[PDB]
Symmetry: C10
Subunit: 127 residues, 10 copies
């Protein structure tokens, strides 16, 4: 029952328990630090995303409103196409009319010239 070696087995035990307690303290410190880091990272993220989340409800209502308006633009476009077709038909009638008006202009020109000769001869005859 060796007293000197039991003494060595008290010394050694003191050293190893010192080592272990230290290792635990360092581990506790590291976990504590990671907790601080994680909480800071989370708080930074929440702070960053605040703006975009609030804006979010507003952006959704604007988009829904825009959809209704865009669909009405699509309908206006369909009506405008119908209007274009009708107006094409009016333009075709007006084109034919301008040609007939052209023929008439020439006839009216001959008439004016003849009236010129008439007024000339009246003027001679009064003179």
């Amino acid at each position: 029952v060796d007293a000197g070696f039991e003494n060595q087995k008290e010394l050694t035990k003191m050293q190893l328990d010192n080592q272990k307690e230290i290792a635990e303290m360092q581990n506790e410190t590291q976990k504590e630090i990671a907790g601080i880091q994680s909480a800071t990272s989370r708080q930074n993220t929440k702070d960053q995303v605040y703006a975009q989340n609030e804006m979010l409800a507003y952006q959704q209502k604007e988009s829904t409103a825009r959809v209704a308006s865009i669909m009405e633009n699509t309908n206006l476009s369909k009506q405008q196409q119908v209007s274009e077709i009708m107006r094409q038909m009016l333009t075709q009638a007006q084109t034919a009319g301008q040609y007939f008006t052209n023929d008439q202009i020439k006839e009216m020109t001959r008439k004016v010239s003849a009236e010129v000769d008439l007024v000339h001869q009246q003027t001679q005859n009064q003179r």
Copy 2:
């Protein structure tokens, strides 16, 4: 066995004291780093956060305006329909006008002959 246990105990109490103050320093430094991170983040998001409310009431105003454009568009669709009908009537009228133009041309021609023969006299 007491003096040697004591040489030991001083070695270990030192070791432990170094480790405590090392850990202490590590926690301090993370404290500084956290405080700096939080503060930078705040200063960064300051502007977007300050613009929030302006952007919101501007968006709401825009919603009201867009809805009024939707209403104007519906009225315009109706107007296109009214104008479609007016245009059909005007096209038929242009065709009748075409015939009138031709009769009027014959009339003008005939008036030319009668001016002519008026001019001898």
Copy 3:
């Protein structure tokens, strides 16, 4: 009071205090480095956000101005809707008018035609006399 133990307690203390003073100087170096780092990071961020913070007030009064203009656009749009409705009624009246006018055009054509016959007649009477 045995010489060995006390003299190697001396020897041991020399080492324990050298390692403690080494560790203290190390910690001091760590905290200083961290201070320099933090100050750098802060000054960086301030320098980064200067412009956006500066533009803030301008952006706000411009936004408020735009709101007033948008609301007036809304009001104008309402007035235009009323104008569209009145103009629809005018157009409807004008369409009916164009139809009545179409019939008038045909009657006038008949008239011109009859006047042509009259002019030919006058011409022929002039020739005949």
Copy 4:
């Protein structure tokens, strides 16, 4: 050698202490990693939340825009036809304007002649 058993035993105390220390350091590293992972996942979800929430709105607005764009295309085609009709009306009208230029000149001669007649009348009535 029942004696060296003792020297071995202190040594066994030393190795076991070493490994339970190492194992606790390992479990610590693992726990830290898991904290960091949960934090990173949470940050990401908080970050992508807004864009994910706008998705459906953006898609339905895009579908509305596609329909409108296609109707604009149809209108563009009708307008091309209208431009063509109108090129022809313009052609007819240019020809008419040239015939009208000749008519303007003849009508001017007529007005001139009427001036001569009115002058003669005035002269006859004055003396």
Copy 5:
């Protein structure tokens, strides 16, 4: 003899510290290098935004004055829409009275057709 334990030990202990001192000094100089670098990078990075700030501000002020004038114009356009609504109502009533006139004038043209015909028939 022991005193020379106390010389060897000192030599070891002090070499330890002088080494640690050189190492700390190195750490600090490296940090200073990195800090200076980081600060200068930031200056280089923010130069352009800072130099554009004043232009952006005065442009924003100009835009504000313009936006306010557009607001005033919109109010004037609203009043104009109102005046024009009244003109359009009056024109609609005018078109209805005109519709009746068109019908009477047609009747007149028809009767004139009969007159011209009868004048040629005799």
Copy 6:
């Protein structure tokens, strides 16, 4: 005796390795955790862009067809500008001839003034 040096040494040597083995295994598990996390973050991040891709593509295709029709319309508008240039030249010559007519018609109105006056004077 020495053989038991060769037992103590082995016990130390093998404890060394079993410790190193537990440590490597820990390293690998940590890396796997980080990798999985990183990959899943990326999936979460790219979800929306990926889900919008198809809408963006078909919208782009629609826009292309529309842009091409605008190009065709622009060509038609150019031709229209040309036709209208010719009409405008003709109208300018017409305005010059009309200018002369205006002067003659004024002379006529003046003479008619003298006629009406002389008719009232007697």
Copy 7:
């Protein structure tokens, strides 16, 4: 104790070796840091080059835009005045349209009466 001098000397060999090693490791850390610094500076300059080169262009374009914006403001004021003038023209025209409505009705009575006259003429000429 000229003997322990020897034991000291091996020890001196050991400390000096330790420090020249440490010093070379230090100079190495410094050199690495300087490489990293020059690299970071170069990257930054290469990065900001484009924006710095666009600066002057953006500024002069902004000055041009300011001048244009201010002229738009002046035009807006003139247009406000034009809207006002035109409100008044429109007012005058609305009043005119009401007087014209009464005129339209009287002219209709006249046309009607002329129809009665033409009819009577036709009747007299027919029988």
Copy 8:
């Protein structure tokens, strides 16, 4: 061949090879971890650039279409310049015409005035008879 040296050469080799095999296993762990990291980073980036690469071809034909439209806008703008020049000439002719027309307006005013006198005269002659 002395027992001490050889037996502690044995003892020493046990340690040197334990530390070499420890280091080898460590390196192996390092390289594996690095492989996993690299594969993760690559797969991440691919996953990140998928969309932009997908949109590439669409963006290119849209850009080419826009180029054709812009060039046609350029051509149209040239035609509009020519139209502006012709219309300037028409406007100049119309301005001269408005001035001649102004004088005609004044002469017509004089005429109406004279006609008023004539109508009063006719009225008075009707009363007088």
Copy 9:
């Protein structure tokens, strides 16, 4: 003194061999990291690089168009000047027309009296 120097020499040759293969591994791992960084960067800049040329010829087209807008604007300034002059002439004409409107009103009034007295007869 040879056997002990040899126990030593084996210890140190081991030490050195571990260090060589440790360094070797470090260089290998940096090789992997570099290759991964270069490859990611390439894949990242692929799209912007592929769009480069399209963006350039589109920009050039835009330059030509903008320059034509500048020319059209100059012509429009001239047109505004022509229209300014036409407008002044039209305003003077409107004033002369105003006087004519008033004479024509007096004339119409006088014609009213003469219609009246024509109606007894």
Copy 10:
């Protein structure tokens, strides 16, 4: 001249030179690695900035062109303001004219009514 201690001073020297050579090898390795990192970082940066630099010359010419166009818009705006003033004056003249036209419309209405009475009495008198 102690041979055994000179022997210790050959052993020790071998150990310390081993240590030093190793430290140098590790340093050389670390510098090599930093060289690899720096070159990769530089190549990544150049690759990244390629696009924006090329674009840069094109962006500068577009901006210069835009400046010329914006300045011409400013000039057009000044002319349009002059045009607005002239048109205000025309609108004022036209407003006065519409009022005079209003008075005339009333007079014309009285005249038409009187012509109605006249045509009525002619129709009675032919009957």
